[PDB]
Design a protein around this ligand. Structure first.
Ligand SMILES: NC(=O)C1=CN([C@@H]2O[C@H](COP(=O)(O)OP(=O)(O)OC[C@H]3O[C@@H](n4cnc5c(N)ncnc54)[C@H](OP(=O)(O)O)[C@@H]3O)[C@@H](O)[C@H]2O)C=CC1
Ligand SMILES: Nc1nc2sc3cccc(CNc4ccc5c(c4)CN([C@@H](CCC(=O)O)C(=O)O)C5=O)c3c2c(=O)[nH]1
Length: 186
């Protein structure tokens, strides 16, 4: 299995969700960025795995579930089986990551992408080891009821460049945003 990564889009006030959806109206190119990052694998005959909590799964419109071209894993202790259209179910983040090295997945999985929500981002971000955060900074405040955990910059270095990530300010629907990549190894 390859690298472990988180990806998120987050307002200035650290918001990531409101009422089961995003705090901001749809930013179609930002969504396509998310698809490109999470789906693209350099490794032949492998795909990337997405790991998400249950509410994040159900926040993706059913049309777009599962996220195509990726293996979709949902975290839940209440569900007894993966939701319709999902591929796997795990009871903890530790369990999910251990599953990626069982026989079934061991030679199928390239990158692992943690796609939220708040509690899985927090536990991953403090998981010892090599981890990257792909953070889109939405450069406005938006009313939110779900928030991104603190990024400890004494361990997460903001990288000064990354191949394939645009460095300039983006703007859709009158909302400016910019892409960042952070890396720790502890
Ligand atoms: N802006 C962005 O980039 C993103 C935005 N979002 C937004 O965030 C909101 C959803 O996130 P959030 O509310 O945090 O909810 P989550 O997606 O984290 O779902 C929480 C549910 O997931 C299960 N769960 C979470 N973590 C674990 C774990 N480690 N092990 C086992 N089960 C776990 C639980 O289910 P159970 O009770 O069944 O055990 C829990 O009640 C929505 O508004 C969505 O739109 C989400 C992702 C990204
Ligand atoms: N930087 C960032 N991180 C995260 S982490 C994360 C976890 C869950 C949900 C979201 C945002 N909600 C979405 C709802 C529908 C779609 C997508 C995302 C992507 N999707 C397509 C492509 C677009 C299409 O093909 O129409 C697809 O992936 O195949 C969808 O159809 C984000 C999200 C986010 O918005 N931005």
């Amino acid at each position: 299995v390859g690298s472990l990564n988180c990806i998120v889009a987050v307002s200035q006030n650290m918001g990531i969700g409101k009422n089961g959806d995003l705090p901001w109206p749809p930013l179609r190119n930002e969504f396509r960025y998310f698809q490109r990052m999470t789906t693209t694998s350099s490794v032949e005959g492998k795909q990337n795995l997405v790991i998400m909590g249950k509410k994040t799964w159900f926040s993706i419109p059913e049309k777009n579930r599962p996220l195509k071209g990726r293996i979709n894993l949902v975290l839940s202790r209440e569900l007894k089986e993966p939701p319709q259209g999902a591929h796997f179910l795990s009871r903890s983040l530790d369990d999910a990551l251990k599953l990626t090295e069982q026989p079934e997945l061991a030679n199928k999985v390239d990158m692992v992408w943690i796609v939220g929500g708040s509690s899985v981002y927090k536990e991953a971000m403090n998981h010892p080891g090599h981890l990257k955060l792909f953070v889109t900074r939405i450069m406005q405040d938006f009313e939110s009821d779900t928030f991104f955990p603190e990024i400890d910059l004494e361990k997460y270095k903001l990288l000064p460049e990354y191949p394939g990530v645009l460095s300039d300010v983006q703007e859709e629907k009158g909302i400016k945003y910019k892409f960042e990549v952070y890396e720790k190894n502890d």
